[PDB]
Amino acid sequence: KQTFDDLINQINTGTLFEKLTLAYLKNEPTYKALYQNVWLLSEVPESYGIPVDLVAEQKNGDLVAIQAKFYTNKVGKSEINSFVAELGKSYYQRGLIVSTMDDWNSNARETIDQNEKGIEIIGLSDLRNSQIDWSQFNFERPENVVVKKPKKLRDYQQTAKENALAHFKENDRGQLIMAPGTGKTFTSLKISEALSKDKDGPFKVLYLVPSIQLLTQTLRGWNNDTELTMTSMAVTSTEDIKASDIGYPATTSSKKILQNWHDFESLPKQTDMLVVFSTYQSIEVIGEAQKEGFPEFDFIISDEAHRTTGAHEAAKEASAFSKVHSNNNVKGLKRMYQTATPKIYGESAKKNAKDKSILLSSMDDESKYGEVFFRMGFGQAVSRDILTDYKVMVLAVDEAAIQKDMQRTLADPENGLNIDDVGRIVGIWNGMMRRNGYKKNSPYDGAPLERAIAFTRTIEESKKVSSQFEEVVNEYISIHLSMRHADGQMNALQKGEVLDWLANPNKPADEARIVSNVRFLTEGIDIPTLDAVIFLSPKKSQVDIVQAVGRIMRKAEGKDYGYIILPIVIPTGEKPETILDNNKNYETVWQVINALRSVDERFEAMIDKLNMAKPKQLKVIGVGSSPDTELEFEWDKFEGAIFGKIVQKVGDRKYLENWSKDVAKIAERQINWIKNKLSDKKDPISLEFKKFVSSLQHNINDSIDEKQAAEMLSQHLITKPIFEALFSEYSFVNQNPVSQAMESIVSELEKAGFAKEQENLEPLYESVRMRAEGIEKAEDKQKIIVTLYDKFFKTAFKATTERLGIVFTPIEVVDFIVHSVDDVLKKHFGKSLASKDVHILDPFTGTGTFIVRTLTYLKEQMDAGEISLADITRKFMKELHANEIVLLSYYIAAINIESTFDEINGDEEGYVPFEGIVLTDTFESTETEDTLDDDYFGTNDERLKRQQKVPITVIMGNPPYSAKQKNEDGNQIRTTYEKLDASLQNSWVETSTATNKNNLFDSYIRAMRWSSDRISDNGVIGFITNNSFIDGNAMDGMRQSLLEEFSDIYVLNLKGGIRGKTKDQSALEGGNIFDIMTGVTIIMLIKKSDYTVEGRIHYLDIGNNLDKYQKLEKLKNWKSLNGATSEFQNIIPNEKGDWINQRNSNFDELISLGNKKGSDSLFIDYTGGLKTGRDNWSWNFSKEQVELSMKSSIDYYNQYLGDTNIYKEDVPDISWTRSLKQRFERRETQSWQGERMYLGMYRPFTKKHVYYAQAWIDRQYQMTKVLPSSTSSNLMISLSNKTGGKQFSTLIVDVLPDVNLFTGGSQNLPKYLYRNNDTGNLFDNSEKYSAIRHEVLNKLPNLSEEDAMYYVYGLFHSIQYGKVYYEDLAKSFPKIPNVKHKEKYIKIGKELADLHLNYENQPICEGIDVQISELNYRVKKMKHPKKGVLDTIIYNESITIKNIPEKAYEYVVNGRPAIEWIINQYQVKTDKKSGITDDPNEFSDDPKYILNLLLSVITVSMRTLELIDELPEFEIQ
DNA sequence: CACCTCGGCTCAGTCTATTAGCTAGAGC
DNA sequence: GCTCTAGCTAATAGACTGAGCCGAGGTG
Ligand SMILES: [K+]
Ligand SMILES: [K+]
């Protein structure tokens, strides 16, 4: 195993050096391509020259005078003066010195730099690091040498080549991203070589690169690895190497460049490639060459392209860097930009900014940079074992500790050292020793690092540390490590020497070696054995930091990890809140952090992980004195604060939501691909895909379309790889039945050319994988999936469906139910959740919370020693079940349950798949099965069949609430289940007394009915459901049936209902648990076969004025039903079937005002308000706007009439209703009817225009009998069908009332009714008659027909009537009594009726003050100046009202004051989706209309209140 | 039947206005 | 590179409707 050192030490103990040089010059690849032949100057042919140790003839025809000196002394001019004289001849073009001594005087360097012909120097290190194998070369001198094996390209490099070729056929620009040490300089060669094949003739390349050292390596590198013949040109025009050290004929000017091509053109046999290695500075010179007729380039490579934006360089040089992007400077057909860090991060100019990590540069301008055609991430490289993973160790040395023990070094002033310089030295030592610091017995983590490079800001510092290093460490008190220094004042030979000294493998053990500098060894020879890179102080250029960090990536046999060490002194007295941001010393930490953000793609994920766990790549070490308390004490606080500061200040980590955009676009491609192949109904793979939909249809629903199949398939392709990364260490092959069936259909499509496009999302998978790496808890893994749901999945699924909804049920609610189900089983059934053959089921598992917290409950019991792990194992393996219809929820649920069980069984056994989960429609499961044999999901529906035959005694869950689609334009078909809906009918619908039984087929009500059926004779049901069934009108039948089935019904009402509630009502409801508007309740059902009487009801109200957090704390405190049984109260249902707010009084004895079935009521008939089903189109302040909206709808309707497909669009042109769709499908053409425009009251005291035409109205009800034509006159008392808890109110109306004029649908009691006058005259075809029934008037004696309205209307305003029958009015249509003295009511009623009909026109009140600054009566939005002040109103900028009486606001109609109705309704608003605006200023000709309206209402309010006082004492008979 | 018209009553949050906190820009 | 400022970006607070769709009732 001889080395180059052995050869040289042999020459030490003439011609033998002339031989090494000759062996080198004829075989070193780059000089094999430069020189045609080489020889000693004795065998030089006689045909040229005059009687220097060597001579060389290059293919140009020019000769070169080579000197082969073997000295042991300082090179003086005496050693050189002879050779330069011999080089003086005309026949010599140049010379080349092969020096064997790295020390050169000032004279020798100047003369060589100035010599016109040009001289290049080579040294020992150049021979050492040559491609020659000196171990197999011998001084027997056979003159046969072994050239080292050239580089072989790898799979990822081969891929980059494939992508480069493919991409550069369509575009002229593309960028190449590859992590450091992976091989992007060698890779670009094979890209150029591959491109060369298409071009017949020579292939001309331009390789740009910032440094000269970096030019030498690229030139030599390409010549070493080229498989083609190559002609090279080194063009040249802050520690860096000089152009004399290139070892290659340097090209000075544009004149020389052109001279080189004319020689290349006049060459007998032109080479395959003519590459010109140039610096970014010399672009000017190459431009002048192209200007003077130098040909354009076939390929322009831009190395270190992240600097080509120009912002990182000095203003002088910065211009040169950016000049590459345009052909104006350098013409080229195509150009490739290669870098390791396309995005550069760093510090902002502001010191006190919150964000310490901001993007400085970026190659996001894809116009000049093109797009990325290949990206080999650092994390990806570590994954495939291409690079070693790094470890950042911040070791904070204690100033207090050092100042004590290092006082000797601090004292001696002959040293230029302070606490910082000494803190740096102990930091280096402790860093290289891998010290553990402030915690095992051992002080170090492992064997010491042997090779490193330290980086300082100044040469003075670098010299300061290294020079006195040996002495300082001795005072500090194994291994003996030495230091060195290097700077730009050295030449290339010395530099090559120090790097060989560092990298020397003959280095003994117990000796480590460090080298210090500033910017000198940032670029240089790769040494894989380099163990660490130390940063001792901040740097000017961040680009240097990024370069330095990449020096440890390469793989070495001994290197497990690369290390980058940050010696930092903490100033004694430092606080943890200010530890890392408020001082210059800490700057170096943020530079490194920003450097990794640029290099490592999973670095953002690494910081998001710091929240719950400390990753392996980061380490904060507390260093005090050497081995055998001030910061030791609070170290745990300081260590944690450092990580906290990182997480806090590194800004804007958006990797998940950025990649989600890329993911959505792939899904769009995949789905389109399917659509195309499905067009070929005959195509063979399309048949296989039909069986896949058929399989989904068998397991789930008939409704599953061919599209929804492609949607599910795409969603699977997104989730599967993420879960693989999220749970890396499980049984390698996926054991999930549904997942396996999904891979079978995909592989089926892969035969047809379909691919997953997974190559690009590898950076994403790497990020996810890092979030989960060190995490070892199920509860933590669940938290990651939640963030993935929030940041990634919603956006990623946008291509398939724009709305994604998964309910994460609050854990306090789930625990309460699981706790109490166990309580119920013991007391009522004498069993437990843990008991044998007690099968639990969650039909709507979602995320799997209920099954999970069931397992954690059994765990807590196992801890107490109540049951075994054999019991829990039994439940998990046999008696736990779960159903989900959504695929994402299914995957989350399966993994969540499998993950949490694996934690419960400790190390008792490994990962076990959960067989209880099934992908189904549970409502469809109990329906009659139909045909499928060949089932992709045959293993999945097999699980269902096992579940079907199991007797279920427990059902938990949070079923989906859905009574109806929100709007018809959505075009959602509600699902049908014959067997279930039939049961639901026969029990809860047939028994209901309501006119409308819509909501009884709500999913949550379906879930209850399904659960009831499933239990059969004995069991328990525990849900969290919609509130409505407790006090809903259509549920009275249901409420009665539950008592018959179940022995016990525990109801814990969590309230939280906002919709249709007053401010007074909403306050008691409090905050909502799910942050929704519907109320919610926990309900526990228990049925027993030996319980034959009506069950009892246990009701508990959580409380009033509670936010959601307070409601959950109460559930947590209680833990169970038993814990809250004290606050529980029993409920006795009345005859009507009410549980809460029970009706009492004589209400049914009173006289009916209206009755659709029967002639008992006072009014012969009444009508509900007009219901359009499209208010934005039908209702508007502007009569013109309505016409425009409706004529648009008619023209749209008629244009596509009959065509059902446009239902899928949802345009602003038209709003659909079931009624209209039926007409649409029935081919009924429509036409505008101007006569059908009405004036009507939309909201109280708010008149609008309506297009009341039958075809465009959902429900006109009995309006044809009340207001036949637009000009019809009538009088109708309007009021809500049911107040629903509101204070009773009414408003007499002269115009067409809207259905929602009052809540719960308005109901209008008319004065007259209209019948056909039985004469054929369409202009006059309606006779009117009184609507009062006479028989009832007898039952109301002393009341004439003419006064009925004024009597009813006068009575409605009595405070007593509303108060006494408040609960009756809340759940029923008003009924009227017979009072002693009616004349009091009739008289009062008439005054109010006249007042309220003339509400628009009324005198202004006494003490009001109207202020008009300028005459502008338009209104945008009326307001109170500040919230709560009623005595003033701001009409607009110019007009304000002042001194309004506050009592006026006591007049309330519906659920809002009369004054506030005007404020609410009269404002300019625009519906976004429809794009229709409702301007109240367009209602009237009078600009002062709305102002005078308000002023009128103010007095109308007051008058009404006065008249309400004069109403008599409410007496019966 | 065959097909239309009528009677409800209930509905798994979404908007606008405010405002603390932070930054990007202008002149030094 | 700073010190101040008017302007955005967030969370944070505050305000708060229209119409679907099962089933009964009509009519020739
Ligand atoms: K000192
Ligand atoms: K385990």
Nearest alpha-carbon partner for A523 in A245, A248, A217, A302 = A217
- For residues A716, A720, A726, A732, the Cα torsion angle rounded to the nearest 10 degrees is 150
Q: Looking at the CA of A904, which ligand is closest?
A: 2
- Rounded CA-CA distance A1136/A1154 in Å is 20
Assigned token pair, A479: 């291994």
CB-facing half-sphere around the CA of A919: CA atoms within 13 A: 26
Q: Is the dihedral of CA A277, A281, A287, A292 positive or negative?
A: negative
Q: Is the dihedral of CA A405, A411, A416, A418 positive or negative?
A: positive
Looking at the structure, do residues A241 and A366 belong to the same domain, yes or no? Answer: yes
Q: Which residues pair with A335 in a beta bridge?
A: A173, A300
Q: Is residue A358 within 8 Å of residue A198, measured between CB atoms? A: no
Chain A residues 1056-1075 with Cβ under 7 Å of strand B are 1058-1060, 1072, 1074-1075
Residue A1177 backbone phi and psi in degrees, to 5: -90, -35
Q: Is residue A809 within 8 Å of residue A846, measured between CB atoms? A: yes
Answer whether any strand B atom is within 7 A of the Cβ of A804.
no
- Identify, with chain letter, the residue nearest to nucleotide B9 (CA–C1'): A1304
Q: Return all residues near A138 (Cβ < 8 A) that are at least 6 apart.
A: none
Nearest nucleotide by C1' from A1371 CA? B9
Distance in Å, residue A348 CA to nucleotide C2 C1': 14
Residue A852 backbone phi and psi in degrees, to 5: -60, -55
Q: DSSP assignment of A232-251, as one string?
A: EEEE-------GGGSSS-EE
Q: Is A213 helix (H, G, I), strand (E, B) or coil?
A: helix
Residue A1027 backbone phi and psi in degrees, to 5: -70, -35
- Rounded CA-CA distance A1098/A1122 in Å is 12
Looking at the structure, do residues A141 and A243 belong to the same domain, yes or no? Answer: no
Residue A122 backbone phi and psi in degrees, to 5: -120, 150
CB-facing half-sphere around the CA of A778: CA atoms within 13 A: 22
Degrees to nearest 5, angle at CA A1038 with A1005 and A1118: 70
Answer whether any strand C atom is within 7 A of the Cβ of A745.
no
| Integer CA distances (angstroms), A148 to A27, A139, A403, A755, A1259, in order | 10, 18, 54, 41, 91
Looking at the structure, do residues A113 and A201 belong to the same domain, yes or no? Answer: no
| Integer CA distances (angstroms), A447 to A391, A625, A1064, in order | 15, 20, 73
Q: Which residues pair with A1419 in a beta bridge?
A: none
Answer whether any strand C atom is within 7 A of the Cβ of A974.
yes
- Rounded CA-CA distance A121/A246 in Å is 8
Assigned token pair, A1198: 């008629």
Q: Is A1120 helix (H, G, I), strand (E, B) or coil?
A: coil
Which residue, chain included where needed, has tokens 């553990």? A436
Q: DSSP assignment of A18-78, as one string?
A: HHHHHHHHHHSHHHHTTEEEEEETTS--TTSS----EEEEETTS-EEEEEE---SS-B-HH
Q: Return all residues near A707 (Cβ < 8 A) that are at least 6 apart.
A: none
Q: Is A1365 helix (H, G, I), strand (E, B) or coil?
A: coil
Looking at the structure, do residues A236 and A107 belong to the same domain, yes or no? Answer: no
Distance in Å, residue A1070 CA to nucleotide C17 C1': 20
Question: For residue A561, is it left (φ>0), alpha (ψ between -120 and 50) or beta?
Answer: beta
- Rounded CA-CA distance A1002/A997 in Å is 10
| Alpha carbon A885 to its chain's center | 24
Burial of A1510 (0-12, 13-18, 19+ CB in 10 A): exposed
- Rounded CA-CA distance A1435/A544 in Å is 64
Chain A residues 116-155 with Cβ under 7 Å of strand B are none
Which residue, chain included where needed, has tokens 């059934």? A829
Q: Is residue A1300 within 8 Å of residue A1321, measured between CB atoms? A: no
Looking at the structure, do residues A168 and A143 belong to the same domain, yes or no? Answer: no
Q: Is the dihedral of CA A1260, A1262, A1264, A1268 positive or negative?
A: negative
Q: Which residues pair with A401 in a beta bridge?
A: none
Nearest alpha-carbon partner for A193 in A227, A224, A153 = A227
Q: Is A1209 helix (H, G, I), strand (E, B) or coil?
A: coil
Neighbours of A1209 (CB within 10 A): 11
- Rounded CA-CA distance A982/A974 in Å is 16
Nearest alpha-carbon partner for A1028 in A1284, A806, A808 = A1284
Q: Is the dihedral of CA A1197, A1198, A1202, A1203 positive or negative?
A: negative
Nearest alpha-carbon partner for A608 in A546, A576, A650, A580 = A650
Q: Is A979 helix (H, G, I), strand (E, B) or coil?
A: helix
CB-facing half-sphere around the CA of A216: CA atoms within 13 A: 24
Q: Is residue A1241 within 8 Å of residue A1293, measured between CB atoms? A: yes
Neighbours of A202 (CB within 10 A): 21
| Integer CA distances (angstroms), A805 to A752, A783, A886, A1484, in order | 34, 17, 10, 45
Neighbours of A1063 (CB within 10 A): 8
Q: Which residues of A479-515 are buried (b: 16+ CB within 10 A; e: fewer)?
A: eebebbbbbbebbbbbbbbbbbebbbeeeeeeebbbb
- Rounded CA-CA distance A93/A63 in Å is 6
CATH number of the domain that A347 lies in?
Answer: 3.40.50.300
Assigned token pair, A312: 């990182």
Q: What spacing in Å lies between the alpha carbon of A977 and ligand 2's midpoint?
A: 42
Q: Is A615 helix (H, G, I), strand (E, B) or coil?
A: coil
Q: Is residue A1171 within 8 Å of residue A1188, measured between CB atoms? A: no
Distance in Å, residue A1442 CA to nucleotide B13 C1': 36
Q: Is A381 helix (H, G, I), strand (E, B) or coil?
A: helix
Q: Which nucleotides of C are covered by protein (CB under 7 A)?
A: 1-3, 14-23, 25
Looking at the structure, do residues A129 and A254 belong to the same domain, yes or no? Answer: no
- Rounded CA-CA distance A757/A751 in Å is 15
Query: What is the DSSP-derived secondary structure letter of residue A1000?
Result: G
Q: What spacing in Å lies between the alpha carbon of A904 and ligand 2's midpoint?
A: 7
Q: What spacing in Å lies between the alpha carbon of A382 and ligand 2's midpoint?
A: 27
Q: Which amino acid is at A607?
A: I
Residue A1052 backbone phi and psi in degrees, to 5: -105, 100
Q: Return all residues near A1297 (Cβ < 8 A) that are at least 6 apart.
A: A1169, A1170, A1240, A1241, A1276, A1278, A1306, A1308
Looking at the structure, do residues A141 and A159 belong to the same domain, yes or no? Answer: no
Distance in Å, residue A1187 CA to nucleotide B3 C1': 31
- For residues A88, A91, A93, A98, the Cα torsion angle rounded to the nearest 10 degrees is -70
Nearest alpha-carbon partner for A466 in A432, A427, A515 = A515
Q: How was this structure determined?
A: X-ray
Looking at the structure, do residues A224 and A113 belong to the same domain, yes or no? Answer: no
CATH number of the domain that A27 lies in?
Answer: 3.40.1350.10
Residue numbers after which chain A is interrupted (C to N above 2.5 A) read 13, 51, 237, 439, 477, 628
Q: Return all residues near A759 (Cβ < 8 A) that are at least 6 apart.
A: A159
Q: Which residues pair with A339 in a beta bridge?
A: A177
Assigned token pair, A1419: 């209104």
Looking at the structure, do residues A370 and A351 belong to the same domain, yes or no? Answer: yes
Q: Is residue A363 within 8 Å of residue A537, measured between CB atoms? A: no
| Alpha carbon A503 to its chain's center | 46
Nearest nucleotide by C1' from A1463 CA? C15
Looking at the structure, do residues A190 and A134 belong to the same domain, yes or no? Answer: no
Length of chain A: 1517
- Rounded CA-CA distance A920/A948 in Å is 12
- Rounded CA-CA distance A17/A1473 in Å is 87
Question: For residue A231, is it left (φ>0), alpha (ψ between -120 and 50) or beta?
Answer: beta
Neighbours of A1061 (CB within 10 A): 18
- Rounded CA-CA distance A57/A45 in Å is 11
DSSP 3-state helix, strand, coil percentages of chain A (rounded to 5)?
40, 15, 40
Helix (H) or strand (E) holding A760: none
Chain A residues 318-357 with Cβ under 7 Å of strand B are 348, 353-355
Q: Which residues pair with A1251 in a beta bridge?
A: A1237
Query: What is the DSSP-derived secondary structure letter of residue A798?
Result: G
Answer whether any strand B atom is within 7 A of the Cβ of A1264.
yes
Nearest nucleotide by C1' from A1461 CA? C16
Nearest alpha-carbon partner for A1119 in A827, A858, A812, A811 = A812
The residue segments making up the domain with residue A46 are 4-147
- For residues A572, A577, A580, A582, the Cα torsion angle rounded to the nearest 10 degrees is -80
HEC letters along A319-332: HHHHHHHCCCCCCE
Q: Is A1353 helix (H, G, I), strand (E, B) or coil?
A: helix
Nearest alpha-carbon partner for A61 in A91, A22, A27 = A91
| Alpha carbon A1315 to its chain's center | 64
Assigned token pair, A649: 């200040």
Distance in Å, residue A349 CA to nucleotide C6 C1': 21
Looking at the structure, do residues A185 and A320 belong to the same domain, yes or no? Answer: yes
- Rounded CA-CA distance A586/A537 in Å is 9
| Beta strands at A343-346 and A335-339: parallel, antiparallel or unpaired | unpaired
Answer whether any strand C atom is within 7 A of the Cβ of A587.
no
Chain A residues 1263-1292 with Cβ under 7 Å of strand C are none
Q: Looking at the CA of A409, which ligand is closest?
A: 1
Q: What spacing in Å lies between the alpha carbon of A1365 and ligand 2's midpoint?
A: 64
Looking at the structure, do residues A317 and A353 belong to the same domain, yes or no? Answer: yes
Q: Return all residues near A1335 (Cβ < 8 A) that are at least 6 apart.
A: A1159
Q: What spacing in Å lies between the alpha carbon of A909 and ligand 2's midpoint?
A: 5
| Alpha carbon A1492 to its chain's center | 53
Q: Is residue A851 within 8 Å of residue A842, measured between CB atoms? A: yes
Q: Return all residues near A424 (Cβ < 8 A) that are at least 6 apart.
A: A465, A536, A537, A567, A569
Nearest alpha-carbon partner for A485 in A505, A524, A513 = A513
Nearest nucleotide by C1' from A1077 CA? B13
